[PDB]
RNA sequence: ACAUAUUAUUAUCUUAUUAUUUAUAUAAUAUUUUUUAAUAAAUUUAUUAAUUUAUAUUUAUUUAUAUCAGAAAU
RNA sequence: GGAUUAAAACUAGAGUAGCGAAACGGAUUCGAUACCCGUGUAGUUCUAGUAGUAAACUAUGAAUACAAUUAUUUAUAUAUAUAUAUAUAAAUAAUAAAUGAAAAUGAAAGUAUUCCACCUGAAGAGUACGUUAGCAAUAAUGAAACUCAAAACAAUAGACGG
RNA sequence: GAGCGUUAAUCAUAAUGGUUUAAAGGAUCCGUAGAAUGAAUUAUAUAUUAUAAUUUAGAGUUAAUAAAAUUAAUUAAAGAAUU
RNA sequence: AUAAGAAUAUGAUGUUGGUUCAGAUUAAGCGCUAAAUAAGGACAUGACACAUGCGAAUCAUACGUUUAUUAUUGAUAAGAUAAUAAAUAUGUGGUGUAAACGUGAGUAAUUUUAUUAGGAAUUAAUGAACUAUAGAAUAAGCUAAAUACUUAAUAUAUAAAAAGGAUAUAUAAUAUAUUUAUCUAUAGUCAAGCCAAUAAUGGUUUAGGUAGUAGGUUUAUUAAGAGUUAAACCUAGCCAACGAUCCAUAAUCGAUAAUGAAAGUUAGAACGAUCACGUUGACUCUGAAAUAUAGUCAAUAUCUAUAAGAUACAGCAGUGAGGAAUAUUGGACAAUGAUCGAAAGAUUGAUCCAGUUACUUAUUAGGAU
């Protein structure tokens, strides 16, 4: 039959309707006594341009269709060099329009300190105005100003105390929660496998069937999955 | 797409009919002709041992 | 340096021959075509030599391109 | 392919104490174009460049896996009855095995694997010619003919040593 | 041995090699090609290769903690001595 | 599967390292020497120049031409006609020389070689010349005449042909029969054109090369693809340090020869395969196929007949030259082939034999006492 090759296009775009192609075949090297790969470039016709550099195509033999072509393109195996040339399209659309958001982005944050930096009046001044009219009984208007500035309308210890809080507090109890989970999973797996009784029990209990006659392997997932859907699930 | 000007599919294979390929080549005379010269008859003799080879 | 021989090349010069392509002929031949003599046969027809007519096939000269080769330069 | 690259040298502009090719003198000597001494120019210095050469050496390309010990530091960690002790790496020194012409190497110059550079008797020769690069000195690349049966390394025993 | 010798030639006769010190490590490093070489598991295939999925022992990124004050470039200073 | 080393350093030792030797061989030369026989080879050099003779002829059953005899005719013999037997290949014709033979100049590959269970454009109304089968073979002209040539007729969009001769018999030139030729068609056989992949010496102190150059489109040309050639219009490509381009050198290869344990290396004489060439260059004709050992023109050399002439020994033998070096100006067509012819036969320096030469191989070249 007509002599099919494999190979990469190395080459397109260059002339009208032709591709270089790079065709590597094994042969042995009787000196060196070694299988080697001889690697030979082909141009090939592309009657439909759609080849592109990277892509892994088969090309088979034709008649002769000029001084040097005498293969064309029958089939693209992979596409990656097609690919490259979509992806490429759409990172310049999808870059630009992030870098307009961030771009918003910095200009607002810019305000946001300008404007902070008009208003001379500081947190410590405005915390000891706060904790001295609530102990003092004074309501000048700055307070009024003070319950916009922060939206504090209510002037009490437990306000001032709700206007100074730290991200670091949250993450404090976040993480003593995820401890909790870990450890408590780990303990409730650890007992029910010491005890075979409790955990045949356990598993029929949360329906499994004939839990019993199940692998190691095989039913320890299962209480795995079950003690981290009974500690993650219901809470 | 193929090449412009080219086949896309191998040309058929040509199989033989040797009842065909015997019709054709080494036919048999249509007619019991009147072999009577001395000619006639060592070519009538010579034409069948050919067609029976 | 250089004097030699050989080869290759060319935006050059000359060029046999050939191919292709131009223009021309009161060009030749055949047929057609228009007439015209001479001759012959018969009692219009044929032949030959001319002229007109187109057609095909050649010939001469001519235009252009390429070309063995030589010259010059490298 | 690229970059960096001692000293000397070179192209400009500064600087120039000391040192110091050369040069001119003083000695020494049979002679002294030297060793020693004097005066001491370039250079040695800085700024901006050119050039890409050294015994540019560990005369030992880089990477990975692996193999028997000791000593000595360093680092990290651990412990305590708190200052040592116990661990794991690195470095260095001396070694076993192995390797090697041996000298020796010693975690490689061992056991293996992967990649690169390079070599094929001496002399001629890193020369000639050509080419490339440089302001230049030069640098890179790099032969052949003729001649010879030499030439070279480690080690051994001598002889000799101002 | 009806040949023998000699000259001219061919093949064989050590790379089942080497490069500290004998010919031979590039001044050094960076890095391109390499038709150079190179992890693990599983499943396919047309099979030491390809593809897919998965993995972290090579190679990296960012932190945290501890440690160190060297090597480049630049700027600003000091010191003994010399003439 | 078959793998050996030796001499030479050094005062001596180990090692590095070259050189030489031991083996086989030749397309061999030379020196000395030499018996017979059988077989295998023989200008590697100047693709230098060539005296002389040969190497391609054959057909009379294509057409003409020339005799002799007999018979008939011709009232005197010049001629004619037919039969028979001969002659003619200095007239017109047919077939044959694209092979074989010789040589290795050119050729490093758009061309050449080798290989592949390769390919299409998806190769002509090509048969070159035999086989099988079927059908046809007509009319004029031109030449002295024809199987010469020319123009027509009819034969698979349809196109595209031809030829008679010999011998008998019967007829009144014609018809049959036999024999040998001619043309067409279909298939077979033999045999052709084109392309791909892979490999094929040295130098980079030849590093850049290319400009129809790389690709696209269209026409011309061809049986047929393609910048293969010519014409037009576009794109800016293509090759290259895994060596492009350039230069030098060389015919290539094997189930051939030599050598080695082998991988390999060498040769390319001999046997066989392939290519190229026939003093040099180009072009054209015929044809399926030729830049043909043809033709044309030119170049070089020679020759005689002095013509827009002939010849070119790389066919055989042979001569001169060159060189260290390579042979008979032999016999035969008996054999195997080839060409012509219907046959009888003719031709054949293909070929087969012999000669020359230890160039190679083999056998023999007296045994017992
Ligand atoms: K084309
Ligand atoms: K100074
Ligand atoms: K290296
Ligand atoms: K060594
Ligand atoms: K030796
Ligand atoms: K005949
Ligand atoms: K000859
Ligand atoms: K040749
Ligand atoms: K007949
Ligand atoms: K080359
Ligand atoms: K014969
Ligand atoms: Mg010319
Ligand atoms: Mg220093
Ligand atoms: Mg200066
Ligand atoms: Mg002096
Ligand atoms: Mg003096
Ligand atoms: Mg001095
Ligand atoms: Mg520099
Ligand atoms: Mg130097
Ligand atoms: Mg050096
Ligand atoms: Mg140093
Ligand atoms: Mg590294
Ligand atoms: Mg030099
Ligand atoms: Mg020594
Ligand atoms: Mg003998
Ligand atoms: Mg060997
Ligand atoms: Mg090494
Ligand atoms: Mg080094
Ligand atoms: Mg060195
Ligand atoms: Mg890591
Ligand atoms: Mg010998
Ligand atoms: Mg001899
Ligand atoms: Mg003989
Ligand atoms: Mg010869
Ligand atoms: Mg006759
Ligand atoms: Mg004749
Ligand atoms: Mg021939
Ligand atoms: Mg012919
Ligand atoms: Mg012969
Ligand atoms: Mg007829
Ligand atoms: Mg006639
Ligand atoms: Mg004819
Ligand atoms: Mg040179
Ligand atoms: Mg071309
Ligand atoms: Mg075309
Ligand atoms: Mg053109
Ligand atoms: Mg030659
Ligand atoms: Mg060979
Ligand atoms: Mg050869
Ligand atoms: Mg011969
Ligand atoms: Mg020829
Ligand atoms: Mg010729
Ligand atoms: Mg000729
Ligand atoms: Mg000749
Ligand atoms: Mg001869
Ligand atoms: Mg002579
Ligand atoms: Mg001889
Ligand atoms: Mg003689
Ligand atoms: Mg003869």
């Known amino acids: 039959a007509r002599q099919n090759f494999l190979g990469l296009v190395v080459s397109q775009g260059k002339m009208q309707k032709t591709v270089k192609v790079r065709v590597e075949t094994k042969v042995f090297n009787k000196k060196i006594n070694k299988e080697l790969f001889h690697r030979r470039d082909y ?27 005498f293969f064309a393109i029958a089939e693209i195996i992979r596409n990656k060099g097609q690919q490259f040339a979509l992806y490429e399209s759409e990172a310049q659309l999808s870059v630009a329009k992030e870098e307009a958001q961030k771009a918003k982005e910095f ?3 810019r305000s946001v300190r300008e404007n902070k930096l008009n208003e001379k009046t500081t947190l410590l001044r405005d915390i000891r105005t706060i904790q001295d009219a609530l102990s003092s009984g004074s309501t000048p208007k700055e307070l009024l100003e003070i319950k916009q500035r922060y939206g504090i309308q209510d002037f009490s210890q437990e306000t001032v105390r709700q206007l100074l809080q730290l991200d670091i507090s949250g993450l404090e109890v976040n993480l003593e929660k ?19 009784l409790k955990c045949d029990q356990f598993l029929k209990d949360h329906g499994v069937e004939d839990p019993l006659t199940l692998k190691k392997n095989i ?8 003690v981290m859907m009974d500690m993650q699930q219901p809470s | 797409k193929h090449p412009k000007g080219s086949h896309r599919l191998s040309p058929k294979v040509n199989f033989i009919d040797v009842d065909n390929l015997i019709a054709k080549t080494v036919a048999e005379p249509q007619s019991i002709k009147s072999s ?5 008859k060592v070519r009538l003799q010579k034409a069948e041992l050919r067609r029976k080879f």
Do not use: C, M, W, Y
Not at chain 1, 178 to 196: A, C, F, P, V, Y
Not at chain 1, 219 to 226: D, I, T
């Open chain 1, 178 to 196: 995820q401890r909790s989970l870990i450890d408590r999973i780990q303990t409730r797996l650890s007992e029910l496998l010491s005890n075979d």
């Open chain 1, 107 to 109: 200009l607002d944050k």
């Open chain 1, 219 to 226: 039913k320890k997932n299962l209480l795995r999955k079950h």
């Open chain 1, 43 to 69: 141009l090939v016709h592309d009657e439909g341009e759609i080849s592109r550099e990277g892509d892994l195509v088969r090309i088979e033999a034709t008649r002769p269709l000029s001084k040097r072509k």
């Open chain 2, 36 to 40: 009577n010269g001395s000619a006639q």
